Amino acid sequence: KETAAAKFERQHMDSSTSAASSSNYCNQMMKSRNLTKDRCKPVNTFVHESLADVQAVCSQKNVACKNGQTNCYQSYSTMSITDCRETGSSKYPNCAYKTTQANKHIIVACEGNPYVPVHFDASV
């Protein structure tokens, strides 16, 4: 019974590294965060900021979600992130990813009491 908040933290939070660090990072992290268990998740973003700083985005700039819901929020600051994208050669179960580091505004969807991130929508 993983909570929606905990699923967001597993899939999207990595405060321990300042920036993607290594060319190995997406290969290791997509596997260790269990995002390659059932299929190769094609894309995924990790955020290298404190949990409190990501949770605070839920009270920042309200923006439309890609799915048309209204509960998305854009960070006023830029944040350190790593984008993981499956290589063309990647075949499950040997899921392979390119690691790219960026500093961008994040967009998250927030739900619940407490009102916390449950989904990573985009970076801009």
Choose the catalytic residue: 8, 9, 12, 14.
Answer: 12
In 3D space, the residue among 63, 66, 72 whose CA is nearest the CA of residue 115 turns out to be: 72
Annotated binding-site residue? 31: no
Is 105 designated active site?
A: no
42 is in an annotated binding site: yes
DSSP annotation of 123: E
Q: Which of 17, 5, 2 is nearest to 82 (CA)?
A: 17
Residue 33 assigned as binding residue: no
DSSP at 18: S
57 annotated to a ligand binding site: no
Residue 48 designated active-site: no
> Which tokens hold the place of 110?
């927030």
Annotated binding site for substrate: 7, 10, 41-45, 66, 85
Catalytic residues: 12, 119
Annotated binding site: 7, 10, 41-45, 66, 85
